[PDB]
């Protein structure tokens, strides 16, 4: 029903069922005096679970595993980090200690290493060129090109028409650019156009942060990125 917001979430994680065998995970971090939520994805893979992204640090990620263990009761066997920043790889060591196989593209592993971030163990091949797609159990992984980061992936759940954009897609309430230090502002709209052209059938679109919507989130993101590009 109601999507969890910061008001409903203290170190804690809430799960939200989007569709059959598909959940978002919602966590929060305090940064620079503000509290910001973050979304990831949980996709049932027969009798196991695939996790998309950490819950933004070690404590949140241990809370995530505890909240999955309580509310779903199926083992997380694999996790994918959609880019090298801490809201995506922070907590990878926690997952690994729990016997989760952690995965990222070689691009993400290299950038995580340069940044001194946690490094997922396993390499995702076949994603190095813009518009590359690879199947990963119950999802398709898609490299749309540089956007929020040079390595960002998006995740589609063909069975449920759920598109998880991670930090490449903004929620409607975000009307100004977020962390764009590692962004390719010049390529971001082209990368969104690749997502639009590949998943024109998506019914649910989950941004990296805040409320889900539909494919209008992609145009929304294009509008915000263009407005930032044109700052005088
Ligand atoms: N906007 C520039 N140029 N660079 N920004 C920064 O160096 N730092 C920074 C920033 F500007 C903005 C944010 S943010 O607004 O909280 N965005 C965040 S926090 C976790 N994920 C994101 C995101 O946008 O996906 C976090 C940051 F660490
Ligand atoms: Zn990021
Ligand atoms: Zn392994
Ligand atoms: Zn982010």
- Burial of 175 (C-beta count, 10 Å sphere; 0-12/13-18/19+): exposed
The DSSP 8-state label assigned to residue 2 in this structure reads: P
| Structural domain boundaries, residue 188 | 1-232
Mutate to test the pocket of ligand 1, among 88, 178, 217 (most ligand atoms within 8 A of CB): 178
Q: How far apart are CA 145 and CA 232, in angstroms?
A: 26
Query: Tokens standing for 183?
Result: 């962004």
60-64 long-range contacts, CB within 8 A, separation 24+: 60/11, 60/13, 60/27, 60/28, 60/29, 60/91, 61/90, 61/91, 61/92, 61/94, 61/95, 62/91, 62/94, 63/11, 63/12, 63/13, 63/27, 64/13, 64/25, 64/27, 64/40, 64/91
Q: Which residues contact 73 (CB under 8 A, 6 or more apart)?
A: none
Is 185 touching ligand 1 by the criterion CB < 6 Å? no
Compute how many other C-beta atoms are within 10 angstroms of the C-beta atom of residue 218.
Answer: 23
Degrees to nearest 5, angle at CA 31 with 29 and 34: 90
**What is the atom index within ligand 1 of the atom nearest the CA of 34?**
16
Q: How far apart are CA 200 and CA 141, in angstroms?
A: 15
Residue 21's alpha-carbon distances to 25, 155, 213, in angstroms, are: 13, 15, 19
Q: Count of alpha carbons within 13 Å of 27, Cβ hemisphere only? A: 27
Q: Which residues contact 7 (CB under 8 A, 6 or more apart)?
A: none
Query: Tokens standing for 5?
Result: 């917001």
**What is the atom index within ligand 1 of the atom nearest the CA of 86?**
20
The rounded Å distance from CA 124 to ligand 2 centre is 19
Q: Count of alpha carbons within 13 Å of 131, Cβ hemisphere only? A: 6
The DSSP 8-state label assigned to residue 81 in this structure reads: -
Query: Tokens standing for 110?
Result: 């290299």
Q: Tell me how many domains the chain contains.
A: 1
Degrees to nearest 5, angle at CA 83 with 78 and 86: 90
Compute how many other C-beta atoms are within 10 angstroms of the C-beta atom of residue 230.
Answer: 7
Residue 80's alpha-carbon distances to 29, 43, 61, 177, 187, in angstroms, are: 20, 11, 13, 25, 24
99-106 long-range contacts, CB within 8 A, separation 24+: 100/51, 100/76, 101/77, 103/78, 103/79, 103/136, 104/80, 104/151, 105/143, 105/151, 105/153
- Burial of 172 (C-beta count, 10 Å sphere; 0-12/13-18/19+): middle
- Helix ranges (H only) for the chain are 58-71, 86-89, 92-97, 106-115, 188-198, 216-229
Residue of 54, 60, 136, 137 lying closest to 96 (CA atoms): 54
Q: How far apart are CA 151 and CA 168, in angstroms?
A: 10
- Give the containing element (helix H, strand E) for 78: strand 76-80
Compute how many other C-beta atoms are within 10 angstroms of the C-beta atom of residue 200.
Answer: 8
Residue 98's alpha-carbon distances to 52, 81, 101, 161, in angstroms, are: 16, 16, 9, 30
Residues with CB under 5 A from ligand 4 (ion): 87, 167, 208
Residue 159's alpha-carbon distances to 5, 25, 122, 137, 139, in angstroms, are: 26, 19, 25, 11, 9
């Amino acid at each position: 029903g109601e999507y969890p917001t910061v008001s409903e979430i203290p170190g804690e994680v809430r799960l939200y069922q989007i569709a059959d065998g598909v959940w978002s995970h919602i966590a929060t971090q305090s940064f620079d005096g503000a509290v910001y939520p973050s979304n990831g994805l949980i996709v049932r893979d027969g009798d196991e679970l695939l996790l998309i992204d950490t819950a933004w640090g070690a404590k949140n990620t241990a809370a995530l595993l505890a909240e999955i263990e309580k509310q779903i009761g199926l083992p997380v066997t694999r996790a994918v980090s959609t880019h090298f920043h801490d809201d995506r790889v922070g907590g990878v060591d926690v997952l690994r200690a729990a016997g989760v196989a952690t995965y990222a593209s070689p691009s993400t592993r290299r950038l995580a290493e340069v940044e001194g971030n946690e490094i997922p163990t396993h390499s995702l091949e076949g994603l190095s060129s813009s518009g590359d797609a690879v199947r990963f159990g119950p999802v398709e992984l898609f490299y749309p090109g540089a956007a929020h980061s040079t390595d960002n992936l998006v995740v589609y759940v063909p069975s449920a028409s759920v598109l998880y954009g991670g930090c490449a897609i903004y929620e409607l309430s975000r009307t100004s650019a977020g962390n764009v230090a590692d962004a390719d502002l010049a390529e971001w709209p082209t990368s969104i156009e690749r997502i639009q052209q590949h998943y024109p059938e998506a019914q649910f679109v989950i941004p990296g942060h805040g409320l889900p919507g539909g494919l209008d989130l992609l145009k929304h993101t294009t509008n915000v990125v263009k407005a930032h590009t044109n700052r005088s």
